[PDB]
């Protein structure tokens, strides 16, 4: 079948501690500079627009990459969690969803 199969699987078994161990991401600098751009550097920001603190992307996209395991909302998760969720998102699109903030942060 030419129909390509992506990783819909997401085991990552957490026990109780939300974010027991999240591997540091070197591009978290781009993620932090984006956060510093769009949020003014506020990962606990909740403007009330449906997009949560830090890199300021929506509940749906957050949930789509499965950020909820880190925290059902980015303003509950920390830098590295917004990084992880955005990591899936950036992985597919690049920084296309991240405007001039990504360019400023180091789009790649």
Can you put this structure into words, describing what you see?
The protein has 108 residues and is mainly alpha-helical. The chain has one domain: Lysozyme, CATH 1.10.530.10. Helix content is 36%, strand content 0%. The protein contains four helices and no strands. It has helices at residues 28-39, 59-64, 79-93, 100-105. The longest helix is centred in the C-terminal third of the chain and has 15 residues, at 79-93. The chain is globular. The termini are far apart. The relative contact order is 0.19.
CATH topology: Lysozyme
Proportion of strand residues: under 5%
Separation, N- and C-terminal Cα atoms:
32 Å
Number of helices: 4
The CATH C-level name is: Mainly Alpha
PDB class: cell cycle, hydrolase
Keywords: lysozyme-like structure, cell cycle, hydrolase
Assembly: monomeric
Entry title: Solution structure of a resuscitation promoting factor domain from Mycobacterium tuberculosis
Observed structural traits:
mainly alpha, 108 residues, Resuscitation-promoting factor RpfB, globular, cell cycle, hydrolase, Lysozyme
Detail the topology: elements first, then pairings.
Layout: H1 28-39, H2 59-64, H3 79-93, H4 100-105
Question: Brief overview, please?
Answer:
The protein has 108 residues and is mostly helical. The protein has helices spanning 28-39, 59-64, 79-93, 100-105.
